[PDB]
CSV table of C-alpha atoms in Angstrom, one decimal:
chain,number,residue,atom,x,y,z
N,10,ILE,CA,41.7,54.5,105.8
N,11,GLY,CA,39.6,57.2,107.5
N,12,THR,CA,36.4,59.0,106.3
N,13,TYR,CA,34.9,62.4,106.1
N,14,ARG,CA,31.4,63.8,105.8
N,15,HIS,CA,30.3,65.6,102.7
N,16,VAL,CA,27.1,67.3,101.8
N,17,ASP,CA,26.1,66.1,98.3
N,18,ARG,CA,25.4,69.1,96.1
N,19,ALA,CA,22.6,67.7,94.0
N,20,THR,CA,20.6,66.0,96.8
N,21,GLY,CA,21.6,67.6,100.1
N,22,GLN,CA,22.4,64.0,101.4
N,23,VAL,CA,25.2,64.0,104.0
N,24,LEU,CA,27.5,61.2,102.8
N,25,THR,CA,30.4,59.5,104.5
N,26,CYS,CA,33.3,59.5,102.1
N,27,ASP,CA,36.6,57.8,102.2
N,28,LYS,CA,39.5,60.0,102.8
N,29,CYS,CA,42.2,60.4,100.1
N,30,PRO,CA,45.8,59.3,101.2
N,31,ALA,CA,48.6,61.8,101.9
N,32,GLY,CA,50.0,63.1,98.6
N,33,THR,CA,46.5,63.2,97.0
N,34,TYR,CA,43.5,65.4,97.2
N,35,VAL,CA,39.8,64.6,96.6
N,36,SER,CA,39.1,65.5,93.0
N,37,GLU,CA,35.5,64.2,93.1
N,38,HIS,CA,33.5,63.6,96.2
N,39,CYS,CA,31.6,60.4,96.7
N,40,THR,CA,27.8,60.4,95.9
N,41,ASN,CA,25.2,57.8,96.8
N,42,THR,CA,26.1,55.8,93.7
N,43,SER,CA,29.9,56.4,93.3
N,44,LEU,CA,33.2,56.3,95.2
N,45,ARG,CA,35.2,59.5,95.8
N,46,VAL,CA,38.1,59.9,93.3
N,47,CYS,CA,41.5,61.0,94.5
N,48,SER,CA,44.2,62.7,92.3
N,49,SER,CA,47.8,63.2,93.1
N,50,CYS,CA,49.0,66.7,94.3
N,51,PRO,CA,50.2,68.7,91.3
N,52,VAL,CA,53.8,69.7,91.2
N,53,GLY,CA,54.2,72.6,93.6
N,54,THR,CA,51.8,71.2,96.2
N,55,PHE,CA,51.5,68.7,99.0
N,56,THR,CA,49.3,67.2,101.6
N,57,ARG,CA,50.8,65.5,104.6
N,58,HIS,CA,48.0,63.3,105.8
N,59,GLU,CA,45.0,61.4,104.6
N,60,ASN,CA,42.5,64.2,104.0
N,61,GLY,CA,39.2,65.3,102.3
N,62,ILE,CA,40.3,68.5,100.8
N,63,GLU,CA,39.8,69.7,97.2
N,64,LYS,CA,43.2,71.3,96.6
N,65,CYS,CA,46.7,70.4,97.9
N,66,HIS,CA,48.7,72.9,100.0
N,67,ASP,CA,51.2,75.1,98.1
N,68,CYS,CA,54.8,74.5,99.0
N,69,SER,CA,56.8,77.4,100.6
N,70,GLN,CA,59.1,79.7,98.6
N,71,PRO,CA,62.4,78.4,97.3
N,72,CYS,CA,65.2,78.3,99.9
N,73,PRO,CA,67.2,81.6,100.0
N,74,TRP,CA,70.8,81.0,99.0
N,75,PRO,CA,73.2,79.8,100.5
N,76,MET,CA,70.5,77.7,102.1
N,77,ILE,CA,69.6,74.4,100.5
N,78,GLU,CA,66.8,71.8,100.6
N,79,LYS,CA,67.0,68.9,103.1
N,80,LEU,CA,63.5,67.9,102.0
N,81,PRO,CA,62.1,68.7,98.5
N,82,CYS,CA,58.7,70.1,97.7
N,83,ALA,CA,57.0,66.7,97.0
N,84,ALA,CA,53.4,65.4,97.1
N,85,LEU,CA,53.8,64.5,100.8
N,86,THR,CA,56.0,67.3,102.2
N,87,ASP,CA,56.6,71.0,101.9
N,88,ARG,CA,60.3,71.8,101.1
N,89,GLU,CA,62.5,72.2,104.1
N,90,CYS,CA,65.5,74.5,104.0
N,91,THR,CA,68.9,74.1,105.7
N,92,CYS,CA,72.3,75.7,105.9
N,93,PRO,CA,74.5,73.3,103.8
N,94,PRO,CA,77.0,71.0,105.5
N,95,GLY,CA,79.9,72.9,107.1
N,96,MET,CA,77.7,75.9,107.8
N,97,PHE,CA,75.3,76.6,110.6
N,98,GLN,CA,72.3,79.1,111.0
N,99,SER,CA,73.0,82.4,112.7
N,100,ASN,CA,70.1,84.9,112.5
N,101,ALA,CA,69.7,85.9,108.9
N,102,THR,CA,71.8,83.3,107.2
N,103,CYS,CA,74.5,80.7,107.3
N,104,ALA,CA,78.0,81.1,108.6
N,105,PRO,CA,80.9,78.6,108.2
N,106,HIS,CA,81.6,76.4,111.2
N,107,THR,CA,84.5,77.4,113.5
N,108,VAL,CA,87.7,75.8,112.4
N,109,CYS,CA,89.5,74.4,115.6
N,110,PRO,CA,93.1,75.4,115.2
N,111,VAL,CA,96.1,73.1,115.7
N,112,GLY,CA,96.3,72.2,119.4
N,113,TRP,CA,92.5,72.2,119.7
N,114,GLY,CA,89.9,69.7,118.7
N,115,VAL,CA,86.1,69.4,118.3
N,116,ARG,CA,84.3,68.9,121.7
N,117,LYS,CA,80.9,69.2,120.1
N,118,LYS,CA,80.1,68.5,116.5
N,119,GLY,CA,78.8,71.5,114.5
N,120,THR,CA,75.2,71.1,113.3
N,121,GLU,CA,72.9,73.0,110.9
N,122,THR,CA,71.8,75.1,113.8
N,123,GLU,CA,74.9,75.4,116.1
N,124,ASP,CA,78.5,76.0,115.5
N,125,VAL,CA,81.3,73.6,116.3
N,126,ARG,CA,82.6,73.8,119.9
N,127,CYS,CA,86.4,73.5,120.3
N,128,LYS,CA,88.5,72.6,123.3
N,129,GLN,CA,92.3,72.6,123.9
N,130,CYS,CA,93.7,69.2,123.5
N,131,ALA,CA,94.0,67.5,127.0
N,132,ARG,CA,97.4,66.1,128.0
N,133,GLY,CA,98.2,62.9,126.2
N,134,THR,CA,96.2,64.1,123.1
N,135,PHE,CA,97.1,66.3,120.2
N,136,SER,CA,95.6,67.8,117.0
N,137,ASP,CA,98.1,68.6,114.2
N,138,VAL,CA,95.7,70.1,111.5
N,139,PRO,CA,93.1,72.8,111.5
N,140,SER,CA,89.6,71.2,111.3
N,141,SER,CA,86.0,72.0,112.0
N,142,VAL,CA,85.5,68.2,112.4
N,143,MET,CA,88.4,66.3,113.9
N,144,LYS,CA,88.9,65.5,117.6
N,145,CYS,CA,92.1,65.6,119.6
N,146,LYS,CA,93.9,62.2,119.0
N,147,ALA,CA,95.6,60.2,121.8
N,148,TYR,CA,99.4,60.0,121.4
N,149,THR,CA,100.9,56.8,120.0
N,150,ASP,CA,101.5,54.5,122.9
N,151,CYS,CA,105.2,54.1,123.0
N,152,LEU,CA,105.1,51.5,125.8
N,153,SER,CA,102.8,49.0,124.1
N,154,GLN,CA,105.0,49.6,121.0
N,155,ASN,CA,108.0,48.0,122.7
N,156,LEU,CA,109.6,51.4,122.1
N,157,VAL,CA,110.2,54.5,124.4
N,158,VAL,CA,109.5,58.3,123.9
N,159,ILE,CA,112.4,59.9,121.9
N,160,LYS,CA,110.6,63.3,121.9
N,161,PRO,CA,107.6,64.3,124.0
N,162,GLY,CA,104.4,65.3,122.2
N,163,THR,CA,102.6,68.6,122.4
N,164,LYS,CA,99.0,69.6,122.0
N,165,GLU,CA,99.9,69.9,118.4
N,166,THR,CA,102.1,66.8,117.7
N,167,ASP,CA,102.3,63.2,118.5
N,168,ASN,CA,105.1,62.0,120.8
N,169,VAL,CA,107.9,60.3,118.7
N,170,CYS,CA,108.6,56.7,119.5
N,171,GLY,CA,112.0,54.7,119.4
N,172,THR,CA,114.9,53.2,121.4
N,173,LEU,CA,118.5,54.0,122.9
W,10,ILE,CA,63.5,60.5,109.6
W,11,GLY,CA,65.5,57.2,109.2
W,12,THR,CA,68.9,56.6,107.6
W,13,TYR,CA,70.6,54.1,105.3
W,14,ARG,CA,74.2,53.2,104.5
W,15,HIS,CA,75.7,53.9,101.1
W,16,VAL,CA,79.1,53.2,99.7
W,17,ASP,CA,80.4,56.4,98.1
W,18,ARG,CA,81.5,55.7,94.6
W,19,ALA,CA,84.5,58.0,94.4
W,20,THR,CA,86.0,57.2,97.8
W,21,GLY,CA,84.7,53.9,98.9
W,22,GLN,CA,83.6,55.6,102.2
W,23,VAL,CA,80.5,53.9,103.8
W,24,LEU,CA,78.3,56.9,104.6
W,25,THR,CA,75.1,57.1,106.6
W,26,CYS,CA,72.5,59.0,104.5
W,27,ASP,CA,69.1,60.3,105.4
W,28,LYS,CA,66.2,58.4,104.0
W,29,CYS,CA,63.9,60.0,101.5
W,30,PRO,CA,60.2,60.3,102.5
W,31,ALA,CA,57.4,58.1,101.0
W,32,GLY,CA,56.5,59.5,97.6
W,33,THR,CA,60.1,60.3,96.8
W,34,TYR,CA,63.2,58.4,95.8
W,35,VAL,CA,67.0,59.2,96.3
W,36,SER,CA,68.1,61.1,93.2
W,37,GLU,CA,71.6,61.7,94.5
W,38,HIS,CA,73.1,60.0,97.5
W,39,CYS,CA,74.9,61.9,100.2
W,40,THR,CA,78.7,62.3,100.0
W,41,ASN,CA,81.1,63.4,102.8
W,42,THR,CA,80.4,67.1,101.9
W,43,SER,CA,76.8,67.1,100.7
W,44,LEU,CA,73.3,66.0,101.7
W,45,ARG,CA,71.3,63.4,99.8
W,46,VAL,CA,68.8,64.9,97.4
W,47,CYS,CA,65.3,63.4,97.1
W,48,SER,CA,63.0,63.8,94.0
W,49,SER,CA,59.3,63.1,93.8
W,50,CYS,CA,58.2,59.8,92.2
W,51,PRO,CA,57.4,60.4,88.5
W,52,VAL,CA,53.9,59.9,87.3
W,53,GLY,CA,53.3,56.1,87.0
W,54,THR,CA,55.4,55.3,90.1
W,55,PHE,CA,55.2,55.2,93.8
W,56,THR,CA,57.0,54.4,97.1
W,57,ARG,CA,55.1,53.6,100.2
W,58,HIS,CA,57.7,54.3,102.9
W,59,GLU,CA,60.6,56.4,103.7
W,60,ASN,CA,63.4,54.7,101.6
W,61,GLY,CA,66.9,54.8,100.1
W,62,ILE,CA,66.1,53.6,96.6
W,63,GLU,CA,67.1,55.1,93.3
W,64,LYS,CA,63.9,54.5,91.4
W,65,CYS,CA,60.2,54.5,92.4
W,66,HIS,CA,58.1,51.3,92.0
W,67,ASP,CA,55.9,51.1,88.9
W,68,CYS,CA,52.2,51.1,89.5
W,69,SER,CA,50.2,48.0,88.5
W,70,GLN,CA,48.3,47.8,85.2
W,71,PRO,CA,45.0,49.8,84.8
W,72,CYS,CA,41.9,48.2,86.4
W,73,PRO,CA,40.1,45.8,84.0
W,74,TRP,CA,36.6,47.1,83.3
W,75,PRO,CA,34.0,47.1,84.9
W,76,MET,CA,36.4,47.4,87.8
W,77,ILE,CA,37.3,50.9,89.0
W,78,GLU,CA,40.0,52.5,91.1
W,79,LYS,CA,39.4,53.0,94.9
W,80,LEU,CA,43.0,54.3,95.2
W,81,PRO,CA,44.8,56.0,92.3
W,82,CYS,CA,48.3,55.4,91.1
W,83,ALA,CA,49.9,58.3,93.1
W,84,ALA,CA,53.4,59.0,94.6
W,85,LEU,CA,52.6,57.2,97.8
W,86,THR,CA,50.3,54.3,96.6
W,87,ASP,CA,49.9,51.8,93.8
W,88,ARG,CA,46.3,51.9,92.3
W,89,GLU,CA,43.9,49.6,93.9
W,90,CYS,CA,41.0,48.1,91.9
W,91,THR,CA,37.5,47.5,93.0
W,92,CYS,CA,34.1,46.4,91.7
W,93,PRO,CA,32.1,49.6,91.6
W,94,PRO,CA,29.3,50.3,94.0
W,95,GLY,CA,26.3,47.9,93.6
W,96,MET,CA,28.6,45.2,92.3
W,97,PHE,CA,30.6,42.6,94.1
W,98,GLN,CA,33.6,40.4,93.0
W,99,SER,CA,33.0,36.9,91.9
W,100,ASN,CA,35.9,35.0,90.4
W,101,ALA,CA,36.8,36.7,87.2
W,102,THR,CA,34.8,39.9,87.5
W,103,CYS,CA,32.0,41.9,89.0
W,104,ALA,CA,28.4,40.8,89.3
W,105,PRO,CA,25.5,43.1,90.4
W,106,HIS,CA,24.3,42.6,93.9
W,107,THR,CA,21.2,40.4,94.6
W,108,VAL,CA,18.0,42.5,94.5
W,109,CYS,CA,15.9,41.5,97.6
W,110,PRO,CA,12.3,41.2,96.2
W,111,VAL,CA,9.2,42.6,97.7
W,112,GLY,CA,8.5,40.8,101.1
W,113,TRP,CA,12.3,40.4,101.7
W,114,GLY,CA,14.9,42.8,103.0
W,115,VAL,CA,18.7,43.1,103.3
W,116,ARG,CA,20.0,41.1,106.3
W,117,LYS,CA,23.6,41.8,105.4
W,118,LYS,CA,24.8,44.7,103.3
W,119,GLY,CA,26.5,43.8,100.0
W,120,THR,CA,30.2,44.8,99.8
W,121,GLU,CA,32.8,44.9,97.0
W,122,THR,CA,33.7,41.3,97.9
W,123,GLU,CA,30.4,39.7,98.9
W,124,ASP,CA,26.9,39.8,97.7
W,125,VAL,CA,23.8,41.1,99.6
W,126,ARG,CA,22.1,38.6,101.9
W,127,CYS,CA,18.3,38.8,101.9
W,128,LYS,CA,15.9,37.4,104.5
W,129,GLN,CA,12.0,37.2,104.4
W,130,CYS,CA,10.5,40.1,106.3
W,131,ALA,CA,9.7,38.9,109.9
W,132,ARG,CA,6.2,39.4,111.2
W,133,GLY,CA,5.4,43.0,112.0
W,134,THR,CA,7.8,44.2,109.3
W,135,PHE,CA,7.4,44.6,105.5
W,136,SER,CA,9.3,45.6,102.4
W,137,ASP,CA,7.3,47.0,99.5
W,138,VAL,CA,10.0,47.7,96.9
W,139,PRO,CA,12.7,45.6,95.3
W,140,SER,CA,16.1,46.7,96.6
W,141,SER,CA,19.6,45.5,97.0
W,142,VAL,CA,19.9,48.0,99.9
W,143,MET,CA,16.8,48.5,102.0
W,144,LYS,CA,15.8,46.5,105.1
W,145,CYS,CA,12.4,45.3,106.2
W,146,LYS,CA,10.6,48.2,107.8
W,147,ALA,CA,8.4,47.9,111.0
W,148,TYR,CA,4.6,48.4,110.5
W,149,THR,CA,3.2,51.8,111.4
W,150,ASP,CA,2.2,51.5,115.1
W,151,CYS,CA,-1.6,52.0,114.9
W,152,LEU,CA,-1.9,51.9,118.7
W,153,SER,CA,0.5,54.8,119.4
W,154,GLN,CA,-1.3,56.6,116.6
W,155,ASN,CA,-4.5,56.7,118.6
W,156,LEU,CA,-5.9,54.7,115.6
W,157,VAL,CA,-6.6,50.9,115.1
W,158,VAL,CA,-5.7,48.5,112.2
W,159,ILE,CA,-8.3,48.8,109.4
W,160,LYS,CA,-6.4,46.2,107.2
W,161,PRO,CA,-3.5,43.9,108.4
W,162,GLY,CA,-0.1,44.3,106.8
W,163,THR,CA,1.8,41.6,104.9
W,164,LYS,CA,5.5,41.0,104.3
W,165,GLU,CA,5.0,43.3,101.4
W,166,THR,CA,2.7,46.1,102.8
W,167,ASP,CA,2.3,48.2,105.8
W,168,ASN,CA,-0.9,47.7,108.0
W,169,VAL,CA,-3.4,50.4,107.3
W,170,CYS,CA,-4.4,52.6,110.2
W,171,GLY,CA,-7.8,54.2,111.1
W,172,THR,CA,-11.1,54.1,113.3
W,173,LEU,CA,-14.7,52.7,113.4
């Protein structure tokens, strides 16, 4: 664990104290006859690193709705805000991901910062349900089924498999 | 930040959740539509690493007197006990460092785990005060003083400097 220099109030001695670990702050500096004492950051506050400071940092303001916390305000971390799952950040706030319609599928997964990116199902694949998550699905392989295609698929529906 | 797998109670889905940072524990696991929620370790408890666990570890028992804390019980660390400054650990407890008598000096600084190690002052050095900390001190250089030695030093006293 690292150290820091401190000027001792009563004697003017410059001491080398031990740092306090992340999550605590120095509640009493060392002196020439005693170790520094660390205390844990009070609720509302944090320190991210081993430090020599006498108060913990205040955590940021609560997340503005509909945003939620992906990290809490805890001893070691400020809160960290995010658009909840299924939404992404645009400018001010959060907006629901695009829903890829039937006949389209996700090409790029939506994130907390970017929207879903849809593409038309390519030939041989289909998507039969609106979804901001699912990808185009390959047709059932009628060949390796011992069957043949009774009815072709579309970008929206699987091909239908059978015989005669 | 790392992840862990969790079996979702209601659906049996095996999800990949985000870990909770050191100092917190997982107070709600992720599900397919919501992020895991971390809470900070309650007073008395700790976690040292980013983790997926549902309770923090209990801190060890208070330090047995005359031992004191060199780390507190805080969110990120169990308490850690030490013999206070000026004492070192031997077996059961703490014992005061050796005091090097006049005519001796510290050869090796005492620690929380080992005692001071004294040596007789070597020629040209002296120590005039009992101390578990101070080293033998070189005589005042009467030459580079423009003076001469009126009275030789001993292992206990400086040489005395003057003229005629």
